[PDB]
């Protein structure tokens, strides 16, 4: 009946599943209406996986595709594609207008959620199947926004992280608890809770969720939020490892102080992701990504640890380079593939493609999942934005 | 088994679901065969919603797309798209040739109905699943025509409003009662029944339907038709509110006399729509749309009331501007999304796009549904017809 | 379980269902890969109807589409489209290579059949679901060929008419009896059996089939073949009505002699079609089509009769002009839409489109079904072949 | 429940099913994004057949399609199409990144497998449904690679042939045994086991599999591998017939010595295929293909035998020319169509299309299945690579 977390399929590393690269088809002579997009992610039901992303109501090539750099507008929608379909106009399915998104399947229906509206009074609407069942207004009146990756559903209830407030300062996240798309409760995030953008969330066992977020103001350490779905509580932490996962970031280990010490820099950031191995009782290993560059959104490097990331300052263990440092690499996202026997967690990579500041902007998506013992290969795009017509 | 009206999902306002904007993809350099169309509407089964519209047997860009301004021809067909698929040639499904349309799902199969033929001897054909099961000839021999929005099915019977006669004068509507697409009875509309074009109809409780129509000859007040499906009776009214919903219209409240008093102007009009909240016994709130302009089809403004619209002359309560007054806004349509637990009603907006008189003509469709407490955002097209190639 | 003929849905005339017109989208500026084709027909299961046709392994516009006039080649395939999908490359489903085709659903699976090979040693292959289950070699070594319209399945067995031999002389048709695509018997056509091309076949009651064919050598009267599926017998007749249905043809009634008298002319011909009303015991009315012109394949006119067409020389009763006489009109085909309550028969029209002799060739398909009391409207293409790019 | 081999449908020859020829649509004026590809094959479930192939993350026409000659890269993916859909961008489904592929349905889910990574440390990943369940690293560190045709599943276990090592020398194949995509055992190939590339495998009865492979270093005779799935053993043989099936090859019968004698030449080769007739206990006839030319990959000729191909040096019996000798013909592949009553085996043909050395490269796929008594027709492409735009 309801989706719930199972023990994960055996795996000790990350290996490539697939890559979608629609703008390979947007060169001179090509015959395709490709869909430029940003903030992509994947979510799955027991029947299918889907690539969700935020579009711009436009295809490339085309005269209107110059707006694709914008973060928020009346054009953007949460749309999706069967996973493995290329990102073309005829493959696209529009779910909700809006400029920040999440989605997740509870075992019976999809919940889709976007934020729509002006920056000072935006509204999250939640769609369950075909109906808008939930509505959640801005509480801080400063760009209400959500994860840009899948939410987590356990036992008929789905858990969505939202935040509202200055992107350059204190902004308190909330956990929304939904049932059939209706917001039935809010969970207050206690502890280290002054930031937490764009959380990537995975169940750590049968009843707990862990979210890896972005602190856009205070620290190059990533916030971690843990949700006890049985108690209905959530607590914020700061990831303690010397291997800081955000971008930009200082040199590894150089932030002096306790685990929850911010560090001197910390302005800016990027959405990050992780994957894991777990039993029904505990997470046994975590897999992390960060950029190659400590200053720019370029490259992707995988790491792993069996330590508790909220407690240990130990460096993470190098797995290897999934995207070379010369290649733009922007957001990354967690997702889980539910199975009949075991579940599997994965990391997707937004390999960014852009002509420059306030010019055409999109991406290619590469997907790596927890399986095997060593990284198999790195990913490239072989797309030169100058060639996009 | 059969579709029947349930109590609606909680909601106290209208908020945006999504928007389809196919001709964003019809600019220079684009690679899409988009489908120019007019009179769009949405209807849903328990399995899916579909965007229905009347096409012109042509895609844009293309040499033949200059006929898309025509109301009636041998080219037009009732076609549909899965709701959320963009309006492209490969996504299109053709149901019936004809130039006026309606469709509705009874819980087992779709009923599709169009009027086809010459103006003086047109025939409505009704298709149930794959078979043409019903045929209804013109009775006034002057453009037999129907709702341009979904019909309503209750307990295995569907209810369709048709009209026939001068668009500039008295034309008596009829309610057709269908079963598996066969016209099994006609219901005579009593009361205020001298007009009633393009009705948007929704169940007001378990057994009654209310239709909001267009009086194209006599009044800027919209006719309302109520159907008792158990008694098999229908009565026409004139909407009494000082907030007149048709376009063009005089200033609010300025029509002197009783509720059913026509007013001095009233020539012309536009299809209108409403949505509602209801229990199994009664409608508890109604939501209405009209243009911003009192003379031109531009803008869309939402209103609400808990009054009986056939009795009270009270002004409606302003919800807000869904489409700015500088933006063309033509037809609007009601539809209902059936649910396993509750039903939901919505308003769709035909945001018109045209190069001018007897030139290329189509639209973008914006959808708002009953949910939340305040209007979230207004809709734009960002399509300049001059840019369509 | 198995498909079998039911009594037909009430109807006393022919009225338009829909029209597919893919090459409306093949003009300058258009963005569609349309599928030029000839010999189209429709067949249905209980789940869906499909438009079948013979393609040329090419789309229009395109450099190779100049071969589309050819009757037979190594390029042609039996392909199909969900009925109502337009005839574009992405909508197409290829079933079997070959240059003469038929298909029919037995209630469990599709049987598809084409003839493939050189003119003097062609082979019919029959595909049941995904497997080639049947193979039937040429017996007269002179263009083995079949109906170019749907076959008929009753009680798990399907009935296919084939012919082999000179198109300008005596060629004896055979009825193939298939089960799961395997040819399990051949039925010898007795009686008037010296010709019978391209039969359009419909059940006349629970156990009999009637086929309306083309005599390409001897007569402007159409051969009729009746199959008793219980006895496993088939007999050929010549349609007796003074209203001769083939093209070219002499003036009505001018063939002197008995019903089976050929008449002096008779060379050439065109595939024809009919529809009917029936109970489980008998056919109660038949509907026929022929061209407007008695010398050229132009126009389509509908007729009806309650007489036995193998016995009565009475003129048929005029229903009216479905396609004006200025419009090319080539093949027509019978098909049946099975229903849960009643079946429905229909006639489809190949409205031909061509640039001329040995130049680009295709069509638009218009569909009329048995329903209502009067013809509703005639069909046009509004496609000028000169405009096809 | 589980797929297992049934007795095959009656048939004594090979006859054409269908052909897919996407680049017919890639000429001047065309409107299609076609998918250039190599190493195509077909695999089927009980629900559908699919055309699998290895793409290049590009469509034709398009600026990037010049890489399509490459064997291995970070661009290639195992993708598939419903069998009968043409090979266009919107029809494509991406399964796994990688440059060598196989896939097979076990009755419940698809197993897809590709090799990904650098030549010296490639990794096979196996995807079962939506999850990566298996991972198998290179064991000889020299282009780990697999069949380029479907694997075989029997009783819930699937059998995949892999090889690793010098393509110009001794390279030992292994049989991987998978369950839900997990590699549960490896079977050592005994006997004649020093080579065995790109095996085409079919069940020979209820519990045994036979694979026809390519010896790329030592012999123009094809290796044959037989797997006893009950014992879990596999043995390699050399095909003994005087009719040598590889290309290039010496004149028939001219290799002096025993069945397992290599012969003096043998460098190079091409993937080959066979089909068969079988009961539940034994294979009763085998059907083979080889090129027309003994030196170039051109033409295709069918043969048959009732002898044991590992024992008898008798020449095979000529069936006939399926592809004329002037037409490029590269890989061929075996596949089986499972049925409710009987199974059917087939041979597919990669009719190669290329502009030349290190230039644009793709193919057309022709399919022949075991049915009938004589070859019906040969296949052509009628594609001139010079015309591809
Ligand atoms: C202003 C707050 C930002 C999040 C920390 C901002 N989010 C939204 C909803 O606008 C993101 C940020 O500006 C962009 C990025 O860092 O790449 C993407 C952008 N995200 C979206 N456009 N959805
Ligand atoms: C002449 C009667 C009119 C309805 C009041 C007319 N309806 C039809 C069937 O022609 C509508 C009207 O002329 C147009 C409009 O007002 O926008 C649309 C147009 N509707 C359609 N073309 N379907
Ligand atoms: C030579 C015998 C003819 C049938 C009487 C011929 N049939 C075939 C299989 O070639 C038809 C005829 O030449 C053409 C026509 O009359 O329109 C179509 C053509 N039919 C097809 N090309 N499938
Ligand atoms: C180097 C080993 C070769 C197999 C014997 C080589 N295989 C791979 C995985 O590269 C094949 C060979 O080079 C090409 C051919 O012979 O056509 C195809 C090519 N196969 C693929 N590109 N998948
Ligand atoms: C999941 O983990 C949390 C934190 O370690 C623990 O309190 C809880 O009991 C665990 N749940 C189960 C079902 O073991
Ligand atoms: C629906 O409303 C009508 C009009 O108010 C009323 O007569 C009827 O009884 C109601 N139906 C139900 C089931 O309450
Ligand atoms: C169908 O019609 C034929 C010919 O008139 C007749 O012989 C047969 O009995 C009929 N079948 C049934 C089931 O009535
Ligand atoms: C299949 O064939 C092998 C080899 O001939 C034989 O050993 C085995 O018994 C056969 N299996 C069955 C089920 O007959
Ligand atoms: Ca930061
Ligand atoms: Ca009016
Ligand atoms: Ca004739
Ligand atoms: Ca060799």
**3-class DSSP string for D251-266:** CCCCCCCCCCCCCCCC
Residue spans per domain, chain B? 14-387
Q: Which of B195-220 are b and which e, b meaning 16 or more Cβ less than 10 Å from the residue's Cβ?
A: bbbbbbbbbbbbbbbbbbbbbbbbbb
Q: What is the D147 CA–ligand 4 centroid distance (Å)?
A: 10
Q: Are D8 and D343 in contact (CB under 8 A)?
A: yes
CA-nearest residue for atom 9, ligand 5, is A281
Q: Are D200 and D272 in contact (CB under 8 A)?
A: yes
Q: Which residues of A are annotated as a binding site?
A: 215, 219, 246, 268
Residue corresponding to tokens 């004809």: B98
State yes or no: is A242 an active-site residue. no
H or E stretch at B134: strand B131-137
Q: Tell me whether A344 touches chain D (CB under 8 Å).
A: yes
Q: Which residues contact B258 (CB under 8 A, 6 or more apart)?
A: none
Experimental method of this PDB entry: X-ray
Q: How many CB atoms neighbour CB D118 within 10 A?
A: 15
Q: Are C383 and C353 in contact (CB under 8 A)?
A: yes
The number of the ligand nearest the C-alpha atom of B262 reads: 10
Q: Tell me the pairing of strands A49-54 and C197-203.
A: unpaired
Instruction: Find the angle CA(C231)-CA(C232)-CA(C238) to the nearest 5 degrees.
Output: 100
Q: Tell me the pairing of strands B152-154 and B131-137.
A: unpaired
Please give the order of strands across the beta sheet that includes D49-54: D38-44, D49-54, D77-82, D93-97
The torsion of the CA quartet C89, C94, C99, C100, rounded to 10 degrees, works out to -120
Q: Give the DSSP per-residue string, B232-291.
A: TEEEEEE---SS--SSS--STT---SSTT---S---------EEEEE-SS-EEEEEEEE-
Rounded distance, CA B201 to CA B189, Å?
Answer: 14
Rounded distance, CA C370 to CA C339, Å?
Answer: 14
Atom from ligand 2 closest to the CA of residue B71? 22
Q: Tell me the pairing of strands D233-238 and D182-191.
A: parallel
β-bridge partners, D368: D16, D347
Q: Which of A94, A109, A126 to mutate to test the interface with B (most CBs of B within 10 A)?
A: A94
Q: How many CB atoms neighbour CB C169 within 10 A?
A: 12
Work out the burial of residue A1: count CB atoms within 10 Å of its CB; fewer than 13 is exposed, 13-18 middle, 19 or more buried.
exposed
Q: Tell me whether D64 touches chain A (CB under 8 Å).
A: yes
Q: Which residues contact C152 (CB under 8 A, 6 or more apart)?
A: C104, C158, C159, C201, C202, C203, C209
**N-to-C CA span, chain B:** 48
Q: Are B237 and B227 in contact (CB under 8 A)?
A: no
Structure tokens at B256: 């002197």
Which residue of C58, C122, C123 is in closest CB contact with D24? C58
Rounded distance, CA B78 to CA B57, Å?
Answer: 10
Rounded distance, CA D332 to CA D291, Å?
Answer: 10
Q: Is A206 in the pocket of ligand 5 (CB under 6 A)?
A: yes
Q: Can you give the length of chain D in residues?
A: 389
Q: Which of A140-178 are b and which e, b meaning 16 or more Cβ less than 10 Å from the residue's Cβ?
A: eebbbbbbbbbbbbbeebbbbbbbbbebeeebbbbbbbb
Sign of CA dihedral C88, C94, C95, C97: positive
Sign of CA dihedral A59, A63, A64, A69: positive
Q: Give the DSSP per-residue string, C336-385.
A: EE--SS-BEEEEEEEEEEESSTTS-EEEEEEEEEE-SSS----B-----G
Which one is the CATH code of B14-387: 3.30.70.870, 3.40.640.10, 2.120.10.10, 3.40.50.720? 2.120.10.10
Please give the order of strands across the beta sheet that includes B110-116: B100-105, B110-116, B123-128, B131-137
**Residue A143: C-alpha distances to residues B167, B380, C385 (Å):** 49, 20, 56
User: C344 and B131: CB-CB below 8 Å?
Assistant: yes
Q: Tell me the pairing of strands B38-44 and C14-20.
A: unpaired
Instruction: Give the DSSP letter of residue C25.
Output: G
Q: Is B27 in the pocket of ligand 6 (CB under 6 A)?
A: no
Which residues does chain C have within 8 Å of residue B79's beta carbon, measured at their own beta carbons? 84
Which residues does chain A have within 8 Å of residue D50's beta carbon, measured at their own beta carbons? none
Rounded distance, CA A313 to CA B87, Å?
Answer: 54
Atom from ligand 2 closest to the CA of residue B214? 5
Which residue intervals of B79-194 are DSSP H helices?
none
Rounded distance, CA C54 to CA C87, Å?
Answer: 12
Rounded distance, CA D147 to CA D126, Å?
Answer: 14
Residue corresponding to tokens 């963005």: C31
Q: Are B373 and A135 in contact (CB under 8 A)?
A: yes
Which residue intervals of chain A are DSSP H helices?
none
Which residue of D62, D93, D116 is in closest CB contact with A30? D62
Q: What is the D230 CA–ligand 8 centroid distance (Å)?
A: 10
Q: Is A7 in the pocket of ligand 5 (CB under 6 A)?
A: no
Q: What is the D195 CA–ligand 12 centroid distance (Å)?
A: 10
- Region for residue B326 given its phi and psi (left: phi exceeds 0; alpha: psi -120 to 50; beta: otherwise): alpha
Cα C24 off chain centre by: 24
Q: Are C239 and C221 in contact (CB under 8 A)?
A: yes
Structure tokens at A42: 């994947």
Q: Tell me whether B21 touches chain A (CB under 8 Å).
A: yes
**Residue C372: C-alpha distances to residues B100, B136, C17, D85, D264 (Å):** 18, 8, 12, 38, 80
Helix-strand-coil split of chain C, %, nearest 5: 5, 45, 50
Instruction: Find the angle CA(C5)-CA(C6)-CA(C11) to the nearest 5 degrees.
Output: 115
Q: Are D38 and A3 in contact (CB under 8 A)?
A: no
Rounded distance, CA A50 to CA A84, Å?
Answer: 8
Q: Is B205 in the pocket of ligand 6 (CB under 6 A)?
A: yes
Rounded distance, CA B168 to CA B185, Å?
Answer: 28
Instruction: Find the angle CA(D2)-CA(D5)-CA(D6) to the nearest 5 degrees.
Output: 110
Q: Give the DSSP per-residue string, C264-329.
A: S---------EEEEE-SS-EEEEEEEE-S-SSSSEEEEEEEESS-TTT--PPPEEEEEEEEEEEE-
Q: Are C254 and C266 in contact (CB under 8 A)?
A: no
Q: Is C162 in the pocket of ligand 3 (CB under 6 A)?
A: no
State yes or no: is D373 an active-site residue. no
Q: What is the D303 CA–ligand 3 centroid distance (Å)?
A: 34
Q: Are D58 and D383 in contact (CB under 8 A)?
A: no
Sequence-ordered strand ranges (E) for A220-273:
223-228, 233-238
């Amino acid at each position: 009946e309801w989706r719930f977390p199972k023990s994960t399929c055996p795996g000790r590393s990350l290996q490539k599943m697939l890559q979608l690269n629609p703008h390979r088809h947007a060169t001179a002579g090509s015959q395709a209406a490709t869909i430029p997009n940003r903030e992509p992610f994947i979510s799955c039901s027991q029947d299918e996986c889907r690539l969700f992303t935020l579009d711009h109501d436009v295809s490339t090539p085309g005269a209107y595709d110059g707006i694709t750099w914008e973060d928020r507008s009346k054009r953007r929608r949460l749309v999706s594609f069967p996973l493995g379909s290329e990102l073309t106009l005829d493959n696209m399915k529009v779910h909700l207008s809006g400029w920040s998104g999440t989605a997740c399947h509870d075992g019976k229906e999809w919940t889709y959620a976007t934020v729509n509206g002006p920056d000072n009074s935006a509204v999250m609407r939640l769609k369950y199947g075909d109906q808008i069942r939930g509505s959640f207004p801005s509480y801080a009146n400063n760009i209400l926004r959500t994860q840009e990756s899948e939410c987590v559903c356990i036992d008929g209830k789905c858990y969505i992280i939202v935040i509202d407030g200055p992107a350059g300062g204190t902004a308190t996240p909330k956990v929304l608890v939904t049932r059939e798309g209706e917001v039935t409760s809010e969970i207050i995030v206690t502890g280290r809770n002054k930031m937490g953008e764009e959380c990537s969330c995975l169940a750590t066992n049968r009843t707990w969720i862990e979210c890896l977020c972005r602190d856009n103001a205070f620290s190059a350490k990533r916030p971690i939020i843990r949700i006890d779905t049985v108690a209905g509580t959530a607590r914020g932490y700061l990831m303690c490892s010397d291997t800081y996962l955000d971008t930009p970031r200082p040199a590894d280990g150089s932030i002096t102080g306790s685990c929850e010490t911010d560090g001197t820099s910390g302005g800016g950031g990027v959405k990050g992701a992780f994957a894991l191995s777990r039993t029904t009782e505990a997470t046994t290993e975590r897999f992390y990504v960060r950029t190659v560059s400590s200053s720019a959104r370029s490259g992707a490097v995988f790491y792993k640890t069996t330590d508790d990331p909220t407690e240990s300052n130990n460096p993470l263990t190098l797995i290897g380079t999934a995207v070379g440092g010369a290649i733009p690499m922007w957001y990354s996202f967690s997702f889980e593939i539910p199975g009949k026997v075991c579940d599997q967690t994965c990391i997707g990579l937004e390999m960014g493609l852009t002509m420059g500041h306030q010019l055409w902007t999109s991406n290619s998506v590469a997907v790596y999942c927890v399986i095997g013992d060593n990284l198999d290969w790195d990913s490239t795009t072989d797309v030169v934005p100058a060639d996009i017509v």
